[PDB]
Design a protein around this ligand. Structure first.
Ligand SMILES: CC(=O)N[C@H]1[NH2+]C[C@H](C(=O)O)[C@H](O)[C@@H]1O
Length: 512
């Protein structure tokens, strides 16, 4: 596809992918590049670094404050008050000022902007965080945290209980707890009243409490999360923790009866001799329809229709895509049409994997379900490709260097045969070194590098009261933490459907 044919397609990640491929082959001239960010659906990361090597975008400072950005630290006292206040939005600018000028400006702004006064006079001390904490300036606290993570201080009960009301709190709490940073901040957050937090924040404050062996506090935080969380899957995770900590059989019972299929509800069902959840059976009789499952532009279009459709239109689309050839689209539509209440675990292009053993089949299918929902031309924001969502680098390494395939192109990852084949190959590499399917899952999403480093630590996937469940909450990247939980449920399910059951309790034992 030339840049001309692409310009005639709707903006989408598919079209971004293809523009990025031209850019990486140096086929975009400085003239082609003029109109080009109007042709880019998501102007972020690699495609933007690459376009900026050709046309280094100058903007953006706002026409209204242009004059304000002509001053420096040495001339800011000659700026009008509006300009003084705008420039003082940057803590780096504040840190750059000399101390006499911070004193002057602190007085100028006392009455009208005490927030600026506080930051100014704080940077006149050897510890700005300590000054801000003493004023209980909550906006200033978060501005300082975002300027530098290195500040760490004990916070009293009054202060920590004010932090949850600021939008910054959730990412702050998660980040320092998951990363095991800012120990004084962490310890201080034991005194947050569960009444003052909810959802993810409450959940992470329970994980925090467990790391200090404050099991009562933890229960209280987990219970608040269970009550406040929107998603049933997240409630179940919280209810599991309530059960593990205080051992109330009504918690486990409630969890065994969840409509969400996840590792926590699966596990609770197995502990209470409850039958395995019902898995829908999708068996369309029509073989084919018009739709090209190998056209990535067709997918991007129909996906947008599906996601924007009223209850009525979903039904017209359900009927149209009720074919074997478009089975992954059928399932995708049915998932949105039943408001995410039924369990779909399809097995498309099955011929390509039926000769592998059943455990490997289940892992492949588990990964595919999470990566793409089996959409052959799926493209991520990082331009990972096909059902098994291969990064192009790896796809080219395997296809050209290892398997010496004639005329290999990375777009071969859009072929099911190739996606499953490469997925098998890469899963052998990972499972050979890692063994557990949970660990394989982590390494598949976030690299074997990061997985090996996490498993090398003496406080991750070792023996303990609350292991391996606690470790699964402390996986340092949120995306990988979530990916692994989901892939593991998928694996259990597919093993079951393939008559190769395994007890999830055995999986958990093999994590220690
Ligand atoms: C096996 C494989 O290619 N893993 C990759 N899958 C897509 C991910 C993404 O962030 O989109 C990563 O590139 C991951 O390493």
């Amino acid at each position: 596809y030339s840049i001309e044919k692409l310009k005639k397609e709707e903006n989408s990640l598919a079209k971004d992918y293809y523009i990025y491929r031209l850019l990486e082959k140096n086929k975009i001239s400085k003239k082609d590049a003029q109109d080009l960010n109007s042709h880019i659906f998501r102007y972020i990361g690699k495609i933007k670094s690459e376009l900026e090597k050709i046309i280094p975008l100058k903007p953006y400072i706002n026409p209204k404050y242009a004059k304000c950005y002509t001053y420096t630290a040495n001339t800011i006292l000659d700026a009008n008050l509006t300009c003084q206040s705008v420039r003082l939005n940057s803590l780096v600018f504040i840190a750059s000022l000399n101390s006499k000028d911070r004193t002057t400006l602190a007085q100028t702004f006392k009455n009208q902007r005490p927030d600026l006064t506080n930051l100014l006079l704080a940077f006149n001390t050897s510890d700005p965080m300590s000054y801000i904490v003493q004023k209980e300036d909550i906006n200033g606290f978060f501005k300082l945290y975002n300027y530098s993570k290195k500040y760490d201080l004990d916070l009293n009960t009054s202060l920590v209980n004010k932090l949850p009301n600021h939008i910054g709190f959730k990412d702050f709490a998660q980040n320092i707890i998951i990363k095991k940073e800012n120990p004084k901040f962490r310890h201080s957050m034991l005194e947050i009243n569960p009444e003052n937090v909810s959802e993810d924040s409450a959940f992470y404050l329970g994980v925090n409490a467990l790391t200090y062996d404050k099991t009562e506090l933890a229960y209280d935080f987990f219970k608040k999360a269970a009550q406040s969380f929107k998603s049933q899957s997240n409630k179940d995770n919280a209810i599991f923790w309530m059960w593990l900590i205080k051992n109330n059989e009504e918690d486990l019972k409630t969890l065994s009866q969840s409509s969400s299929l996840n590792i926590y509800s699966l596990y609770a069902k197995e502990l209470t001799n409850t039958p395995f959840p019902k898995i829908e059976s999708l068996n369309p009789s029509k073989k084919k329809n018009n739709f090209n499952m190998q056209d990535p532009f067709a997918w991007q279009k129909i996906n947008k229709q599906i996601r924007d459709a009223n209850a009525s239109q979903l039904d017209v689309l359900a009927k149209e895509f009720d074919t074997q050839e478009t089975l992954p689209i059928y399932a995708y539509i049915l998932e949105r049409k039943n408001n995410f209440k039924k369990h779909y675990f399809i097995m498309p292009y099955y011929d390509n994997i039926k000769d592998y053993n059943k455990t490997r089949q289940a892992l492949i299918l588990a990964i595919a379900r999470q990566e793409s929902r089996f959409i052959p031309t799926a493209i991520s924001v990082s331009y990972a490709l096909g059902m098994m969502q291969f990064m192009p680098f790896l796809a080219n390494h395997i296809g050209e260097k290892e398997l010496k395939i004639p005329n290999f192109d990375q777009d071969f990852m859009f072929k099911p045969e190739i996606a499953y084949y490469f997925g098998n190959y890469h899963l052998n590499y990972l499972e050979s070194r890692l063994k557990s399917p949970l660990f394989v899952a982590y390494a598949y999403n976030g690299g074997i590098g990061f997985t090996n480093r996490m498993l090398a630590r003496n406080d991750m996937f070792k023996t303990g009261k609350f292991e391996p469940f606690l470790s699964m909450e402390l996986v340092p990247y949120q995306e990988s933490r979530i990916y692994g939980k989901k892939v593991l449920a998928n694996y259990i399910v597919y093993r079951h459907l393939l008559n190769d059951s395994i007890k999830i309790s055995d999986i958990f034992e093999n994590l220690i």
